[PDB]
């Protein structure tokens, strides 16, 4: 059988690998770089652009930019350099031998679905491809065919109810606020404490801090009080150049913005609220499976203690005769990619791929007939 590349298009880390595996084989930063100089590096082989660990390590002669922001490809030309790095550097294989499965947000722009279809087929010469919604794959990685996924990436949060592998297209909810925003917010609130960070070389350490030290409080007022009454809600972090900084209440405040969007000037409702407002669009005979199968997904859901908080919040909005229970997979950060590996290795799914001939007949638009 043809080995598929499953490539999860993350807004902060790219997760990529071969199908038939139950885990990604490549994980690298979603960063693309270009020279500070008027040309190539002195006395060394020619490259016009740099990616991942090469861009992170050669940084002193580069300007760096991001290819994807808030679940949207914000520059085609840099998403291409992630793809070029993915096939030829990280997996060291010809993509033209390997069908491609691409992850996307719910309601990902159609002009974008097409530019992705076109770029894969014309430049990389892929033999076949498909594009799939993040939450739909995370449900398959949760071992269940019907349920709802709260998927919170490194840049967007969605609530996506699904019946027997199809997402319900009227009931989906979106919130631009998650891991990208969360770093910029964390950085603001640290400046406020008097640990001013103003440089993007600091922003990436603030990102790492966030991933290591943030935790979801079970009760926001009680933890806030605890930090005001005692300094036991603070953890030290030693920066790379020495200098021990102390991270305080910012730990739980940073992710608190997910429950209360008004903290950062947004008019949107919270992630638990948009869970409730999503399920109540669905039929009563299926609401039982949706409320019982609330699945957490994506990088932002890997903060400890999240389940007890989300269990609380949803039972408070939802009637006490829908069964309520949080499903948190063992490695929920990868569940989109794992579900993509499962889907790409089903025997019945091999009829679903976009072929190169159908692309030659209908242009990039074929994704709106073969995909959903």
């Amino acid at each position: 059988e043809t080995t598929a590349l499953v490539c999860d298009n993350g807004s902060g880390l790219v997760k990529a690998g071969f199908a038939g595996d139950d885990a990604p084989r490549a994980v690298f930063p979603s960063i693309v770089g270009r020279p500070r100089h008027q040309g190539v590096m002195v006395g060394m082989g020619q490259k016009d652009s740099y990616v991942g660990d090469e861009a992170q390590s050669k940084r002193g002669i580069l300007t760096l930019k991001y290819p994807i922001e808030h679940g949207i490809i914000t520059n085609w030309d840099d998403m291409e350099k992630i793809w070029h790095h993915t096939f030829y550097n990280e997996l060291r294989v010809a993509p033209e031998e390997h069908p491609t499965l691409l992850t996307e947000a719910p309601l990902n722009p159609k002009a974008n679905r097409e530019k992705m279809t076109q770029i894969m087929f014309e430049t990389f010469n892929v033999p076949a491809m498909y594009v799939a919604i993040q939450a739909v794959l995370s449900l398959y990685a949760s071992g269940r065919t019907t349920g709802i996924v709260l998927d919170s990436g490194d840049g967007v949060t969605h609530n996506v109810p699904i019946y027997e592998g199809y997402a319900l297209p009227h009931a989906i909810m979106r919130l631009d606020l998650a891991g990208r925003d969360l770093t910029d917010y964390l950085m603001k609130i640290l400046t406020e404490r008097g640990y001013s960070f103003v440089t993007t070389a600091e922003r990436e350490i603030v990102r790492d801090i966030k991933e290591k030290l943030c935790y979801v409080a079970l009760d926001f007022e009680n933890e806030m009080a605890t930090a005001a009454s005692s300094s036991s809600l603070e953890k030290s972090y030693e920066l790379p150049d020495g200098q021990v900084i102390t991270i305080g209440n910012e730990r739980f405040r940073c992710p608190e913005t997910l429950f209360q969007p008004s903290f950062i000037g947004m008019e949107s409702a919270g992630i638990h609220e948009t869970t409730y407002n999503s399920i109540m669009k669905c039929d009563i005979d299926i609401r039982k499976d949706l409320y019982a199968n609330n699945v957490l997904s994506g990088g932002t859901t890997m903060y400890p203690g999240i389940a007890d908080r989300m269990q609380k919040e949803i039972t408070a909005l939802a009637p006490s005769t829908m069964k309520i229970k949080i499903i948190a997979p063992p490695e929920r950060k990868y569940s989109v990619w794992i579900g993509g590996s499962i889907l790409a290795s089903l025997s019945t799914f091999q009829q679903m791929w976009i072929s190169k001939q159908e692309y030659d007949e209908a242009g990039p638009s074929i994704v709106h007939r073969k995909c959903f």
Binding site: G143, A292, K323, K325, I327, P330
Partner: protein, 59 residues
């Protein structure tokens, strides 16, 4: 996860059994009440039957 999927099942089974049981209970509850009702109607019919028998004997 195998325990979580089974646990889930065991709750759903507990609900379905609680619900199925309660319908059997409501029906049972109804059967006792019907019996009490019929016993009362039987008493009434036996009494009418005797009262008719007196009337038939009499003429």
């Amino acid at each position: 996860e195998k325990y979580s999927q089974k646990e889930d099942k065991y709750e759903e089974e507990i609900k379905v059994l609680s619900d199925k049981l309660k319908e059997a209970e409501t029906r049972a509850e109804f059967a006792e009440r019907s019996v009490t009702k019929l016993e009362k109607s039987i008493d009434d019919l036996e009494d009418e039957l005797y009262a008719q028998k007196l009337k038939y004997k009499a003429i």
